[PDB]
Design a protein around this ligand. Structure first.
Ligand SMILES: COC(=O)[C@@H](N)Cc1ccccc1
Ligand SMILES: [Ca+2]
Ligand SMILES: [Ca+2]
Ligand SMILES: [Ca+2]
Ligand SMILES: [Ca+2]
Ligand SMILES: [Zn+2]
Length: 316
């Protein structure tokens, strides 16, 4: 909407207070005009019609329980935008400052979140499996990264290309979490998963097997569930990424870590320059090797570590 840029304050899902960029015109809207062509957050009102109504608030204070998922979807979308701009010189998900739109309070007891081709969408969870999913910065960045992939490699969402699509979202979701530097880890969804169980998460990148996911290509899922295992076989790529960054010895293959920033540079270049809609794991390895060569040289340690990481997870 047309109005003047303002700054509100509220409380997120985890009870933390944060300032949020809003817009004033009679009401205060969750519309952040300081980033690109705007970040817009909507109320889906427990229904499934999208996007719902642009979030309006009478006093620019967002401390009601009902407000909390909106606060975090809006704030964490901004942080993710900042990451892509400041770290990779990418302006929003299309590279052209496209408006970023999110809906919260999607459906009733909905234990998921997703990118629907046009916007991000967050359930509130059922209170036992999940609390409102926009409470996880890695969740928000995972979803916005799906948009980035849609506009770049376009990885089809099934089988190996879909597991790469998923792993890209977990990788950059995690790198955004580290960027924001609030309780960062290599786990996915720990801030919103199972409020009655401490220490768990939905997925682990450092040890995918902790939650049953494969950490070696020989252990890949080959059936048809989950679009052919896109959230399962992502563990193979997530482990490789973790090893590129942090190092380790895995199935007897030793990897010298090169750190998160170089991981991000290599996989961002692969995503935006070399991957295609039908890329499989072996092609992802080639894309990462070429990206690391581009950035650091064919004889670099970075190239050597990419190769060792993919060797360690059985991807030639
Ligand atoms: C111009 O009047 C309108 O658009 C009316 N819907 C009143 C309204 C104004 C601004 C914000 C919300 C409601
Ligand atoms: Ca208010
Ligand atoms: Ca964390
Ligand atoms: Ca995490
Ligand atoms: Ca938990
Ligand atoms: Zn995903």
């Amino acid at each position: 909407i047309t109005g003047t840029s303002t700054v509100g304050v509220g409380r997120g899902v985890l009870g933390d207070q944060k300032n949020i960029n809003t817009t004033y015109s009679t009401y205060y809207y969750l519309q952040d005009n300081t980033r690109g062509n705007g970040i817009f957050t909507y109320d889906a009102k427990y229904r499934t019609t999208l996007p719902g109504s642009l979030w309006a608030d009478a006093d620019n204070q967002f401390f009601a329980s009902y407000d909390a998922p909106a606060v975090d979807a809006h704030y964490y979308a901004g942080v993710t935008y900042d990451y892509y701009k400041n770290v990779h010189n990418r302006l929003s998900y299309d590279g052209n400052n496209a408006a970023i739109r999110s809906s919260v309070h999607y459906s009733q007891g909905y234990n998921n979140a997703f990118w629907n081709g046009s916007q991000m969408v967050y359930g509130d969870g059922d209170g036992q499996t999940f609390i409102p999913l926009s409470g996880g910065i890695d969740v928000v960045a995972h979803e916005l990264t799906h948009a980035v992939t849609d506009y770049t490699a376009g990885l089809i969402y099934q089988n190996e290309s879909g597991a790469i699509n998923e792993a890209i979202s977990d990788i950059f979701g995690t790198l955004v979490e580290f960027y924001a530097n609030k309780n960062p880890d290599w786990e996915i969804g720990e801030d919103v998963y199972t409020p009655g169980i401490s220490g768990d998460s939905l997925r682990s990148m450092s040890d995918p097997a902790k939650y049953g996911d494969p950490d070696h290509y020989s252990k890949r899922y080959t059936g048809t569930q989950d679009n052919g295992g896109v959230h399962i076989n992502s563990g193979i790529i997530n482990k490789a990424a973790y090893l590129i960054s942090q190092g380790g010895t895995h199935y007897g293959v030793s990897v010298v870590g090169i750190g998160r920033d170089k991981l991000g540079k290599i996989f961002y270049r692969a995503l935006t320059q070399y991957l295609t809609p039908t890329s499989n794991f072996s092609q992802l390895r080639a894309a990462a090797v070429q990206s690391a060569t581009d950035l650091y040289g064919s004889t670099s340690q970075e190239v050597a570590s990419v190769k060792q990481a993919f060797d360690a997870v059985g991807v030639k």
